């Protein structure tokens with residue numbers, strides 16, 4: 001996701017932390033954050049080159065098919081196993097288990113990475129085809145503007161919804177997502193939070209590629225103009241994935257710090 005998606009996910013998550021997790025997050029955040037996790041949920045994107053080793057950790061590349069397997073797909077351009085967003089989530093959640101224990105890692109970074117990557121693993125086109133670079137090479141128009149399909153999913157759909165209903169800001173969208181988490185999707189939310197291991201990234205990635213095939217890629221050809229029909233039909237999936245991301249980020253931090 002772009003800025004708006006990560007902010008939404010982290011705002012939802014921080015309000016769903018239990019007391020012990022809320023305290024740990026406040027302690028691990030720098031003073032400059034003023035206690036707001038969402039103010040740093042794009043930090044990972046800014047260190048893609050400062051920490052070049054981190055760039056493959058934002059996504060998963062799959063073959064041209066609608067399936068994800070950790071062993072097959074979680075690896076970077078040198079084939080190094082684990083170097084994908086799922087592997088990163090396992091890494092940084094494990095690191096955070098070390099908070100306040102008697103026993104090398106910067107746990108502020110671990111928090112910022114897990115927060116961002118929990119978001120990215122929910123963007124459908126972050127678990128999609130290597131052959132089109134997760135939709136980055138699929139050039140279309142979003143209404144009147146040229147854009148690639150990946151960018152439409154990272155940013156354009158959310159921003160257009162913001163402008164359509166929420167006066168070009170994310171607060172109204174956040175409150176509507178929270179409303180639905182409580183009153184429309186309560187049953188689902190309980191399932192989203194369930195994880196028998198730290199975290200369950202492979203579950204999230206498998207959902208993501210299914211969404212990529214069913215919703216993101218579906219019906220789209222190079223050069224198409226995506227407009228109201230695509231926007232209105234895909235918006236609910238975006239809402240679902242943002243809500244899942246926020247719910248799962250909170251549930252994961254609650255497990256880690258409890």
Ligand SMILES: *[C@@H]1O[C@H](CO)[C@@H](O[C@@H]2O[C@H](CO)[C@@H](O[C@@H]3O[C@H](CO)[C@@H](O)[C@H](O[C@H]4O[C@H](CO)[C@@H](O)[C@H](O)[C@@H]4O)[C@@H]3O)[C@H](O)[C@H]2NC(C)=O)[C@H](O)[C@H]1NC(C)=O
Pocket residue numbers: 053057082083084087088089091092104105106109
């Ligand atoms: C789990 O989280 C940790 C902490 O963020 C993260 O560890 C980092 O791993 C990278 C490598 O993946 C380390 O970067 C290396 O640093 C060493 C020396 O400090 C350098 O020599 C390396 O440069 C060589 O290797 C590169 C290949 O990675 C080449 O491209 C390059 O040309 C050089 O030959 C490299 O920069 C980094 O230091 C650690 N940091 C810490 C604190 O351990 C780890 O990758 C995460 N794993 C996941 C998410 O799977």
Ligand SMILES: *[C@@H]1O[C@H](CO)[C@@H](O[C@@H]2O[C@H](CO)[C@@H](O)[C@H](O)[C@H]2NC(C)=O)[C@H](O)[C@H]1NC(C)=O
Pocket residue numbers: 030040043106107108109
């Ligand atoms: C733990 O990691 C964070 C993030 O990398 C470090 O905070 C950064 O520190 C650098 C250098 O002092 C500054 O330029 C940035 O302003 C800081 N970023 C943030 C988000 O706070 C922190 O210093 C690290 N702790 C260590 C290395 O002990």
Ligand SMILES: *[C@@H]1O[C@H](CO)[C@@H](O)[C@H](O)[C@H]1NC(C)=O
Pocket residue numbers: 173176177180184239240
């Ligand atoms: C909330 O759910 C209602 C009813 O299903 C739906 O009309 C609305 O679009 C949803 N809003 C969000 C932000 O998901």
Ligand SMILES: [Zn+2]
Pocket residue numbers: 001002006119120123
């Ligand atoms: Zn993102």
Ligand SMILES: [Zn+2]
Pocket residue numbers: 001002123126150154
């Ligand atoms: Zn992206």
Ligand SMILES: [Zn+2]
Pocket residue numbers: 001044045058116120
């Ligand atoms: Zn990212």
